[PDB]
Amino acid sequence: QVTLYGTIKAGVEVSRVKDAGTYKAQGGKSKTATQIADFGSKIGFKGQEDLGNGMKAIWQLEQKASIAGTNSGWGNRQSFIGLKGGFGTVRAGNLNTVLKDSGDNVNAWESGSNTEDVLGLGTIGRVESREISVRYDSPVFAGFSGSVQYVPRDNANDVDKYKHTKSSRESYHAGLKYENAGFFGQYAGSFAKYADLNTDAERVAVNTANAHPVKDYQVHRVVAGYDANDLYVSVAGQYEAAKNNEVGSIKGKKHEQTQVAATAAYRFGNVTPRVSYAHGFKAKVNGVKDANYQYDQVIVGADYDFSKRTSALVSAGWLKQGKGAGKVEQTASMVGLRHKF
Amino acid sequence: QVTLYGTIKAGVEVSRVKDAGTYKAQGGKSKTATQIADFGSKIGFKGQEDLGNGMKAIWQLEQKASIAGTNSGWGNRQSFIGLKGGFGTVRAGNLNTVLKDSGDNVNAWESGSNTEDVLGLGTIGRVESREISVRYDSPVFAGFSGSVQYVPRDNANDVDKYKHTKSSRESYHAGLKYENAGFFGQYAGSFAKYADLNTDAERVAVNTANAHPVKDYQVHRVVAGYDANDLYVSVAGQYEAAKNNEVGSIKGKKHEQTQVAATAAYRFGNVTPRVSYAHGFKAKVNGVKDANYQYDQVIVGADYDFSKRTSALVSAGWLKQGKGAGKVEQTASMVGLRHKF
Amino acid sequence: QVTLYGTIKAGVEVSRVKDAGTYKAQGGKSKTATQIADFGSKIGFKGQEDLGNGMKAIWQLEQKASIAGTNSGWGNRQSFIGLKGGFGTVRAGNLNTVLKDSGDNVNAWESGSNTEDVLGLGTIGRVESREISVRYDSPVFAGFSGSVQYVPRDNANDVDKYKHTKSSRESYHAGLKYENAGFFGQYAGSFAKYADLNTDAERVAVNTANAHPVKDYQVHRVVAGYDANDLYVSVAGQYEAAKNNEVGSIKGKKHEQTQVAATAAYRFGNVTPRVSYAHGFKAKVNGVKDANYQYDQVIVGADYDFSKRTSALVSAGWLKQGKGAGKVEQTASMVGLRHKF
Ligand SMILES: OC[C@H]1O[C@@H](O)[C@H](O)[C@@H](O)[C@H]1O
């Protein structure tokens, strides 16, 4: 037993950026770019086999498959092997981060890469990723279900395998989930004694060029909401903080930012309008308030369901970053199509 | 509903090149090289879903899959998503160029890459390609069927997305087709206000190293012929011209070349002999006659059909390029196998 | 007719290296590295079609598919097209080397790349590989079955296609096999008039940076053993020798090394313990005895079969290389899982 699946999603997206620093014409406005873009098409193979008494073996190989022909490689999307049974589920491989799964109730938009921060809640999703790791998921007991996941010190840094001279970048991920009559709330987060971030607060591999080492890197996320009776509402809160670990005068100083995201949608028959807001409060960088990281964004859109597998998509987004003259505003809109197989 | 398809084609090809400039031994003759080569094996996944009243959703991901293990990546061959119905068909993605489809009645040979110009009509097919774009194909009305296709300015040049400082490389492609009782004629072509060509008259991405910018780049192709009753005959004509747009003394001057190709084949039971000729008249480069682009080529061969999906292939080709001492002659022959699945 | 297959295999492996030259702490011992690693997962598509009277067409595209997401490309594992029938089988493409197939009775261990020499008989398998080539396999007559395979001069070196100025790196591979009532012995080997080796006695492509050209490169392997009644025993012998062909003072001098490998395993119900030993006698490099190439290794382990397709794996290995102060000792152990589909 093995099945083939995936989804092909593409559309045309119009965008324009307002930046006074990089564009000098007309009050900092760039020209409007119109493109055909892949919304992240993917194709995978998964299978399962009953082993006898309550245990089943499970594997999956999923790849990024852009219909523009820009992707390549196997298992770059969730791909794994594991075992399931009464005890729950245990998987190893390129695995989604518990915080990446919790992303399903946080970001419901589709878009191309270039517009992932204005046509989708991309900024609050800068903490999500896939890591080579092991992961446990306990069954659903009384509406409760949980997940614990770990990334080895030698998987987070291979170069340092035999000479442990760099602080371990090993990390733990966990999440808890409660569901009842259409009401659901969940906590998801991750902690890393030592890790590296780029200037976009995203986690990068040790020794990336412009990467800033950090200590006690922790990410927290709580998402609660209602999903049933043609109605969907979702509020999410997220806190991120770490201590500067880059040798120099500012080592030890604190980094932190709070983000909130809101989304609601109603299902009229085959049309589902939807709206989402997101904000990133002023961020503390090296102990000081940094307003460059503050942002406000709102996305409105609707999905037309031709069938349970095919949808037509339309959406627009207004995004503002920073404050003052270093400020950047992004507006974009798209129309596209999604087919799940 | 989703299907798996592709074809595996390989063979051994013998070749020798006669060039007085690069080879000094024996009147300019090179040694004879004999290789095992992939004839362009490929594998793809496509699927369709009825949406209700006369509309069907359609997608396809096809990749180059060489059995020599030299290819990599997804959707580098025609890959797309679109909709079909009474109105015809509409597709977006890595799509074949209307001129690339018209190639089916122009080049019927199989070969490895190194011999695509001597074991196949490759020179007349230097205008064919795949471009990220949208494309319309109207139904077949009274033997008539048509196709209109467009490649965005920001898809033909991504770097220039927000600062339109480079002339648009957006292009249009169209073709018309008539079929009646085994008789068929079609026009296919493309126009680009601005584009770039390499010295082989092939279109390359803006800012390729040795790439010459051009203006009013247009390609025309007419192919007519008979295909039925065990008989196949096909004549094709092709015109290409553009104005030099490379800043300097020769900007504005005219480039152009006319190419013709002929092919016929008769089906004795399971054997199908075939022969093809092709010529490239002297080309006008910067207004001046250039005989380096002139060429003559003839390919003879036969296909043995073991079954409708499997064939045995044999072919030879004599090709002469240019005139005089800069002249190059290529001769090659091959025996191979093709399995379609 | 076409089928999908492959296997997903991963596990965690603990390792430590003892080298006095590269590690200075504690008598040359490195720290112990613990990793999650792909044991070489792979996925392929193969198909066959009856052509009529006793002939069938056969093709296969197999790719390395790591569940860690580190592989990419098509047909990098055995991939081919060919014909089968009364006469036996004939294939062309990325094909396994006759010596690579004989590897099945020589190395029965699973492991990640980093531990292929301590958790598997990797050193004796440094002569195995895949080469673009043609290959014949004659049927099994009276327990006897044979294989002859060849790699073209222009496939082993493409750059030199038209100017044969580098000595041909074309090579021949052959093997013979006898099987009777659980008893089986086979010879497998390869010869190359000219070839290139790296310092690990592995064959590399001409013009690799640190590659040493050789002449009369021959590899011999005899493997005999018993496989039936829950019992498996296998002894293998291997000889390798070539003449230095690197221009200089030592050209012409002789290189050679003898390797032996032993493995046995008994099948209690679903558990199969197993043990293997391997030795590499002192090697003659440029006529002189080199003890750096001498080695001793022993691997113990067991496989728990959950089902015919799924197994649980456990293994450990002690490996010593060289002699004296340049000496290197490797110890490693792993626990993992393998699912065949
Ligand atoms: O949020 C959008 C995504 O939803 C998933 O369930 C689906 O597998 C993807 O193809 C994509 O449509």
Ligand SMILES: OC[C@H]1O[C@@H](O)[C@H](O)[C@@H](O)[C@H]1O
């Ligand atoms: O012209 C040759 C080609 O014909 C196509 O129809 C087929 O899909 C390919 O596999 C290749 O055989």
Ligand SMILES: OC[C@H]1O[C@@H](O)[C@H](O)[C@@H](O)[C@H]1O
């Ligand atoms: O030696 C181990 C291998 O055995 C093969 O037969 C199987 O196809 C592979 O998946 C791997 O398990």
Ligand SMILES: [Cs+]
């Ligand atoms: Cs992300």
Ligand SMILES: [Cs+]
């Ligand atoms: Cs990552």
Ligand SMILES: [Cs+]
């Ligand atoms: Cs082409």
Ligand SMILES: [Cs+]
């Ligand atoms: Cs192209």
Ligand SMILES: [Cs+]
């Ligand atoms: Cs090997």
Ligand SMILES: [Cs+]
């Ligand atoms: Cs090789």
